[PDB]
Amino acid sequence: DEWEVSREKITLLRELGQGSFGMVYEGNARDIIKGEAETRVAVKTVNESASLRERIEFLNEASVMKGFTCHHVVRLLGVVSKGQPTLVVMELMAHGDLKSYLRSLRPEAENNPGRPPPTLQEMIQMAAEIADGMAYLNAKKFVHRDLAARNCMVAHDFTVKIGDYYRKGGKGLLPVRWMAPESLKDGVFTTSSDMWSFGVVLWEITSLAEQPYQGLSNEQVLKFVMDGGYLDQPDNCPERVTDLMRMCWQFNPKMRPTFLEIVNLLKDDLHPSFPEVSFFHSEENK
Template identity: 70%
Template sequence: YIPDEWEVSREKITVIRELGQGSFGMVYEGLAVGLVAEGEETKVALKTVNELATMRERIEFLNEASVMKAFKCHHVVRLLGVVSQGQPALVIMELMTRGDLKSYLRSLRPDAKEGLAGCPMSKRAPTLFPYLNANKFVHRDLAARNCMVSEDFT
C-alpha cells in the first residue's frame, strides 16, 4: 500500500467509543479534524486492523480501503480517509448512526423493548445493485449484518 491523497495524519483522529467488531478488527466512533473543512470536526467510523493480524491481512485491509476510493454512491458507505502510517492502520469512513440493518430491523420487532414505530427505510436502495454492477464489483458477503443504516434511514 502506497500512501496517497487519502492519507490522514493520525494526530487529526480521536477515538470516542467502540462500536463493534468488523471483519479485520474493531470499529470505533471517532472524530476527525479537518476532513470536511479546516479545523472542523466530523464524526466518523474508524475501522482498525487487529494487532495480531499478519502482514498479508494488513495489506488486504488497506486494499479494501483502496477499492472504496472509487465508489461515489449515496448507497455505499463513503471512505473519508486512511491512516496507513504507524499502528494500527485506520480506515476512516462515514458514520452510519443507526448501525447495521440486522440490528435495526430487530429493534422494530413488536417484542423489542425500545422498538421504533414504522420503518422509514429508503425505497431507492435497489439503485445500489446496478451501480455495483456497472463498476464490476461483487461484494461476496452481502448480508443484513453488513448493510449499514444512516441517520436518514438510507
C-alpha cells in the same frame, strides 16, 4: 494518495464492534471534509494478531474504496497508512446495521425507539437505496456475494447504504440462507445471485429480520432452495414488496431483474432528494 489523514486528527470515542480485520470504533475526525470542522466517523483497525499479509490487505481494500463515490454505498473518508496502528476512516452510519435496526422496531423489542415499524413508503425507499447502491457496485464490476440486512447500514437520517449464518465450503464460507439456488449448486456468484439475496433482504425488511428458513437446518435450506423452494411471504406483507420478492426469486437467474431495473420500478414514489443523490439518475448512468 490525497486520502492520507494525520493520525492526530482522529479521536476515538467508543467501540462499535468487530469487523473483518479488527475492532471498529466510533470517533471524530478534525478537518476531514471541507466546510466541516469535525465529522463523525467510523474508524476501522486491524488486530495485532494480524499477519503482515492481512495488514497489507486491510490497506489494499481501502485503496479499492477510493474508487467509490455513491450516496448509497458507505464511503471511505480517509486512511492512516503511515506508522502503526493503521486506520481506515469511514462515513459513520449512526443507526448501525439494518438487521439490528429492523429488530429494534419489533413491538416486543427492549430497545424499541418508540416509533412504529417501517411504513410502505419507508420500505420502498429502503429498497430503492439498497438497489441503487448495488447497481453502482455492479457498474463498478463488483459482485457483492454477501448481501443481507446485516451488511446494510442505516444513516443518521435513515438512509440505507451498502456497507463492508455461514457454512464451510469448497471455496470458503457460504451465507447459505441468502444464496441463490445456482450458487448452492456450483458456487458461482453473479449480480443475478446478488438479486436473489436482495429479495431475501426485502423479506427481512418485511419480517423485521426474522431468520430466513427458521426451523430448517443449513443442510435442509440447501436442499429446499436447490429444489426450487423459497421463503413464504411474511404476515401482512405489502403486495408491492411481495411482487419484488417474486421477481428476485425466479429459479432461472436470467429471469431476475437487474438492480437498475429495480430502481426504475420504484423511482416514481421516492423522496424528492433521490434523483439528486442516486447513481441511477446520475450522469455516470446516462
